[PDB]
Design a protein around this ligand. Structure first.
Ligand SMILES: CN1CCN(c2c(Nc3ccc(O[C@H]4O[C@H](CO)[C@@H](O)[C@H](O)[C@@H]4O)c(Cl)c3)c(=O)c2=O)CC1
Length: 158
């Protein structure tokens, strides 16, 4: 089991960390959701699918920077919504192919307060998302840590 990002950064067997720079809508109005879709940016696969089933959760999600300061929202994992920052580990998703498939995670973030300033700063850490991988073959229990950085500024006009 290993993963890679859209920019070509790999996290190998046994886990590790990677930086993911996410394209953000540059203007988000009061009452609108900012969508941070990681399913287009993070992909994983099973390295022995004929014999092993891999299990994958969103173990933890934490908010930082402008997201923590200025937004409130939820995380959607594999079709279900949960509080963000997270307060539990999600159910597990099966990975059963050598062909890469998305890690089905997305953030839905609503502005809390604004006076028209920069709500999210380009280059800043905005989230840490932990992917936990196990299987039905041995005792492997591995963490794939996705450090999420804003690729661009976001403004919430007023
Ligand atoms: C056709 N040939 C294929 C290769 N091959 C063999 C193995 N291959 C193999 C490859 C990767 C393995 O572990 C990693 O990938 C698993 C599947 O994603 C994850 O669950 C693990 O957590 C870990 O990330 C493991 Cl345990 C085993 C054997 O065992 C074995 O025999 C011989 C037969």
């Amino acid at each position: 089991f290993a993963c890679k990002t859209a920019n070509g950064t790999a996290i190998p067997i046994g886990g590790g960390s990677a930086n993911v720079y996410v394209n953000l809508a540059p203007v988000v109005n009061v009452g609108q959701n900012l969508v941070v879709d990681l399913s287009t940016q993070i992909f994983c696969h099973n390295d022995y699918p004929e014999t092993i089933t891999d299990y994958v959760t969103l173990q933890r999600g934490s908010a930082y920077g402008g997201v923590l300061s200025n937004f409130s929202g939820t995380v959607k994992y594999s079709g279900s919504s949960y509080p963000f920052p997270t307060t539990s580990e999600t159910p597990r998703v099966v990975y059963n192919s050598r062909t890469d498939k998305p890690w089905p995670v997305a953030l839905y973030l609503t502005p809390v307060s604004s006076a028209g300033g920069v709500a999210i700063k380009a280059g800043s850490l905005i989230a840490v998302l932990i992917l936990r991988q196990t299987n039905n073959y041995n005792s492997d229990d591995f963490q794939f840590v996705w450090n999420i950085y804003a690729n661009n500024d976001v403004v919430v006009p007023t």
